[PDB]
Amino acid sequence: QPEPDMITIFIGTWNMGNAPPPKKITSWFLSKGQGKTRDDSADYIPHDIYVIGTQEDPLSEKEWLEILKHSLQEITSVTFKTVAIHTLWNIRIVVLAKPEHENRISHICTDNVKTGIANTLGNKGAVGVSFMFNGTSLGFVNSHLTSGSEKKLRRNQNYMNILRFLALGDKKLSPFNITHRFTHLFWFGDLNYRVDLPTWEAETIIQKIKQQQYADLLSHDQLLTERREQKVFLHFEEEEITFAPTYRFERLTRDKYAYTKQKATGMKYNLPSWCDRVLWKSYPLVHVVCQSYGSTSDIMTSDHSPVFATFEAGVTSQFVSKNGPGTVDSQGQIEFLRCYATLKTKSQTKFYLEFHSSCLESFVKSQEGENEEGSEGELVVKFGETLPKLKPIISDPEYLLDQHILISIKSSDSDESYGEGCIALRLEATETQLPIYTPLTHHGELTGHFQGEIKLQTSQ
Ligand SMILES: *Sc1ccccc1Cl
Known part of the structure; x- marks a missing residue:
């Protein structure tokens, strides 16, 4: 059945x-x-x-x-x-x-x-x-x-x-x-x-x-x-x-x-x-x-x-x-290129990301991003090519392309989330740099944006 x-x-x-x-x-x-x-x-x-x-x-x-x-x-x-x-x-x-x-x-x-x-x-x-x-x-x-x-x-x-x-x-x-x-x-x-x-x-x-x-x-x-x-x-x-x-x-x-x-x-x-x-x-x-x-x-x-x-x-x-x-599949990986968060916050603290997904054995913390001033007053948190390589538990594309990565951007000072969003792994292509985007919310209100590129390797 x-x-x-x-x-x-x-x-x-x-x-x-x-x-x-x-x-x-x-x-x-x-x-x-x-x-x-x-x-x-x-x-x-x-x-x-x-x-x-x-x-x-x-x-x-x-x-x-x-x-x-x-x-x-x-x-x-x-x-x-x-x-x-x-x-x-x-x-x-x-x-x-x-x-x-x-x-x-x-x-x-x-x-x-x-x-x-x-x-x-x-x-x-x-x-x-x-x-x-x-x-x-x-x-x-x-x-x-x-x-x-x-x-x-x-x-x-x-x-x-x-x-x-x-x-x-x-x-x-x-x-x-x-x-x-x-x-x-x-x-x-x-x-x-x-x-x-x-x-x-x-x-x-x-x-x-x-x-x-x-x-x-x-x-x-x-x-x-x-x-x-x-x-x-x-x-x-x-x-x-x-x-x-x-x-x-x-x-x-x-x-x-x-x-x-x-x-x-x-x-x-x-x-x-x-x-x-x-x-x-x-x-x-x-x-x-x-x-x-x-x-x-x-x-x-x-x-x-x-x-x-x-x-x-x-x-x-x-x-x-x-x-x-119960283990990783070395044939799978998720990479992030040219990523940055744009945040509405008036505050100046360092930020890091957390990646959460049931395709990971547990959540992954990034290094701190680099803060810059946006041209219209915004905080831009640059991760560049610095985000970790994520190791999914299964590499089969029939599984992996159906998954999602939740992203939180957290204050280094307080570990409080300033924004949450979600990225689909249902990509047009694997082994190819492709744009990604999510809005970021906190308490369900818009607080910013996360965008960049993804490169997904599956067993195919
Ligand atoms: S089942 C559940 C879900 C979220 C918080 C606490 C519990 Cl017991």
Whole structure:
């Protein structure tokens, strides 16, 4: 039975509004309703992995697991295995996988982050799961961010706290936050970004939704605008939104948006908004294709509609050679030429690099670079031809060209990372000097750039 080189992943996000679900929720897992929907001819084909994020979930873990497993069994005739479940308050993540994947999945991690301080600590934050699927690391974050049209900055702050403090993936990757630890990272939830139009325009917005004319609403969506100004979710992707706003509905119909201010809303308007979202970030030149992104039309217990997204995701096998793992393969090497970091820091300390990759026996520290002044005020850290030669554990090009090198630039004075990035070894050529480039971030904010040339030797 061959190891897969592609899997499909279902991501669901639903804010349940502290109400039990209806008896049938299969439309969610079938990607049926509004938006980019799944072909009917696929309905019996199980996804490899289902990741369900809920918010305002009133159920016990046991109650929800029974609903989910029985739903998937009805659709697919497959009894899914529970990989992980983690709940913080009423925020929950469930990972289910086909039974054939049980011995492909390992290194399962769960964590949560509580956002806010005093007043604002007590119901918002995130849960997450990570694991290895054969040679591929997968991370999943379900967040319920701060509500309210006038709190987009708080949401962005909640995002940065979650990506700093959520402890998933390989703890040996100590310089790297969750935005660098995974081949594929899926981040979803009730992100709570709103359509930022005047209150007086509520009936106009509803009119536009009834006509399926979303363009003038999406141009005011706070997540799209904040992402375009690099205030949040830098270097993440989102599929085009082609479904109606998923909030705020009157319960038991989808015929009505409930937007007017009420005691129950803290006298806040809730103009129709795309609160409920799925974003991803995959390492460079790895296959990831969104095959659905939409909302259900027939699940009406909540003031939110469920959102679904599905993905094709490239995966690799757990490679063994005569040599690595447990030694190097002298036939493999990674060299760096003409490399320099450009950093935004106003500080003057020496810097060195760390190279981290599961193709190395352990991480590699460089010598200190040479600091120069850039012509527009920047710090340029020159490594020239001084970076070490990296010794991969396996030289086979079928393995090595599928790997990635994480790079941290660290202060010699403090050993604190000033920037993190990632370089794909999926090169156009081996034994050939080729340009490389990554942006550098720290706490998910842009801090600089790393560029230079690479020369990769494989056993071919
Ligand atoms: S499994 C895991 C991942 C990251 C930090 C700590 C742990 Cl136990």
